[PDB]
Design goal:
Apical membrane antigen 1, 0% strand, rod-shaped, mainly alpha
Length: 20
């Protein structure tokens, strides 16, 4: 069992993020 904190990376434009 690996002890490491997960960071959710947004591949498709910061995870459905709207451009401004």
């Amino acid at each position: 069992m690996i002890k490491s904190a997960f960071l959710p990376t947004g591949a498709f434009k910061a995870d459905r993020y709207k451009s401004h």
